[PDB]
Each structure stands twice: as structure tokens, then as C-alpha cells.
């Protein structure tokens, strides 16, 4: 805020100024993965890939 000194302040009033900032988001960080029914007879690789992805 600004300020001024003195007793008489006729026609010396001030307005209000409030600035602002903008925030956005970027693109997702995906992780695709493709498998077949055979490769899920063990599931250890699936679990390990999920953990590594996280």
C-alpha cells in the first residue's frame, strides 16, 4: 500500500490494486504396457514392472 503525510487529503484518495499469478499443468507422464495371456502365468515380471514404473 502507498501512504501520504498531512492533515488535509482532499481529492488525494487512492484506489486498490491486487495483482495475481497464474498456475497451470503440463502433459501426463504415461507408461504404456502390452502383454498377452501367456505372460501372466507368473506375474512376477508384471509386479516388478509396476513397481519400477512408480
Amino acid at each position: 500500500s502507498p501512504t501520504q503525510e498531512g492533515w488535509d487529503l482532499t481529492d488525494k484518495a487512492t484506489g486498490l490494486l491486487e495483482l495475481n499469478v497464474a498456475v497451470n499443468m503440463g502433459e501426463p507422464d504415461n507408461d504404456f504396457f502390452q502383454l498377452r495371456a501367456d505372460d501372466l502365468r507368473d506375474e512376477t515380471a508384471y509386479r516388478r514392472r509396476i513397481q519400477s514404473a512408480a
Binding site: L35, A37, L40, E43, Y46
Partner: protein, 54 residues
């Protein structure tokens, strides 16, 4: 190795081979009951991977 021999002699660069099925015939089939087996495996399509299908 010779302990496993099942034929009285070897092949000698001229031994003529006789074919036994010289005419069409519907085969009768005999065996020992522990000669033919049927291996089987599951298809794990119940996994969480295959969503959208039951």
C-alpha cells in the same frame, strides 16, 4: 550307450527300405496305457489386465 540298443545292426549305405503301408486302410491302433499323455495349461484371462471382458 550300447546298453540301450534296440536293433540288431546298423545301416550300411545300401540297405533297401521297404514301405509297409502299400495300400489304404483304416488303422486299428493299440498301445500301452502310459504311452499317450495330454498336457494342459490354463489361460489366465481372469487377471486385472483384461478389463472390459468377463
Amino acid at each position: 550307450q550300447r546298453a540301450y540298443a534296440n536293433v540288431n545292426t546298423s545301416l550300411a549305405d545300401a540297405m533297401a527300405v521297404n514301405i509297409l503301408n502299400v495300400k489304404d486302410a483304416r488303422t486299428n491302433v493299440f498301445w500301452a496305457d502310459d504311452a499317450i499323455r495330454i498336457v494342459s495349461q490354463p489361460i489366465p484371462a481372469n487377471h486385472e489386465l483384461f478389463a472390459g471382458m468377463k
